[PDB]
Amino acid sequence: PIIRIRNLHKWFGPLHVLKGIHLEVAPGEKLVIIGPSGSGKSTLIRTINRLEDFQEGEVVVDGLSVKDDRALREIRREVGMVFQQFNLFPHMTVLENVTLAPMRVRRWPREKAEKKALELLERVGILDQARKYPAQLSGGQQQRVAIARALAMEPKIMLFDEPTSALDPEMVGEVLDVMRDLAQGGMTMVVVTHEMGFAREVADRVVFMDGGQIVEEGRPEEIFTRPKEERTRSFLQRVLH
Numbered sequence: 001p002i003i004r005i006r007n008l009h010k011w012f013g014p015l016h017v018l019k020g021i022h023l024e025v026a027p028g029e030k031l032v033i034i035g036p037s038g039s040g041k042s043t044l045i046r047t048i049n050r051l052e053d054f055q056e057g058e059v060v061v062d063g064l065s066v067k068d069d070r071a072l073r074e075i076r077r078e079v080g081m082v083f084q085q086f087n088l089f090p091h092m093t094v095l096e097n098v099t100l101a102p103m104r105v106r107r108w109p110r111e112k113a114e115k116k117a118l119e120l121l122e123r124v125g126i127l128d129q130a131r132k133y134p135a136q137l138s139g140g141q142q143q144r145v146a147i148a149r150a151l152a153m154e155p156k157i158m159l160f161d162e163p164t165s166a167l168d169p170e171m172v173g174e175v176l177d178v179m180r181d182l183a184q185g186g187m188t189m190v191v192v193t194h195e196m197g198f199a200r201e202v203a204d205r206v207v208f209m210d211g212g213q214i215v216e217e218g219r220p221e222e223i224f225t226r227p228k229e230e231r232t233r234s235f236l237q238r239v240l241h
């Protein structure tokens with residue numbers, strides 16, 4: 001599998017936040033992670049691209065240990081991330097924001113970088129904004145720039161940590177649409193979300209976290225209409241309908 005996590009334990013000071021997670025994600029997999037805030041979802045996906053370390057267990061991405069100091073560069077080349085907050089460079093255009101890393105990191109000539117960026121911007125519906133600055137864009141558009149930027153590095157894995165959670169309600173659908181499109185293809189995707197209709201339509205597999213644990217996982221239909229675990233049923237009665 002392209003992501004391999006065995007017996008992951010993680011402490012923030014005295015707080016046992018991740019409690020022996022096992023997770024094996026296939027190449028091409030669309031994995032959706034759900035669960036109450038505080039359950040440990042962000043922390044878990046942050047261990048994948050080495051934004052968080054941990055004291056017990058193993059985390060291996062594309063056959064490389066995340067704790068291998070010699071991998072902490074290849075890991076960032078092949079793993080993209082979209083956060084709920086956009087961190088665009090305010091004094092660079094949309095286009096410049098997208099081409100920066102492929103130019104800095106992959107040492108792509110600007111003409112190559114821009115050609116790919118432009119195709120990506122069209123892909124996510126914002127080619128018209130190519131020469132705008134981030135402050136002229138809505139929340140929906142800015143997050144789509146962040147997605148284009150992540151994809152511009154051409155990673156094998158895209159992590160989405162609740163990309164729509166901080167957006168105005170009318171901004172959510174357009175960002176989710178970009179993620180629906182990407183899910184039609186072969187990219188490995190891990191997305192944390194509270195958008196359950198989306199989760200249900202896109203996921204190969206849904207993982208429910210509570211208390212720093214994977215309490216239940218399975219196919220979307222099973223998890224949403226036949227949850228085998230009580231805490232799962234309890235979580236779904238609190239948030240659905």
Ligand SMILES: Nc1ncnc2c1ncn2[C@@H]1O[C@H](COP(=O)(O)OP(=O)(O)O)[C@@H](O)[C@H]1O
Nearest residue numbers: 012013017035036037038039040041042043044
């Ligand atoms: N850098 C940190 N230091 C200390 N505690 C943290 C840190 N980051 C998160 N936490 C705590 O760890 C728990 C898990 O947080 P998080 O992974 O962000 O949960 P979720 O994303 O599921 O809402 C929360 O109780 C949070 O307060």
Ligand SMILES: [Cl-]
Nearest residue numbers: 162163164193
């Ligand atoms: Cl989301």
Ligand SMILES: [Mg+2]
Nearest residue numbers: 028030183204
């Ligand atoms: Mg598929």
Ligand SMILES: [Mg+2]
Nearest residue numbers: 041042043162
């Ligand atoms: Mg979170």
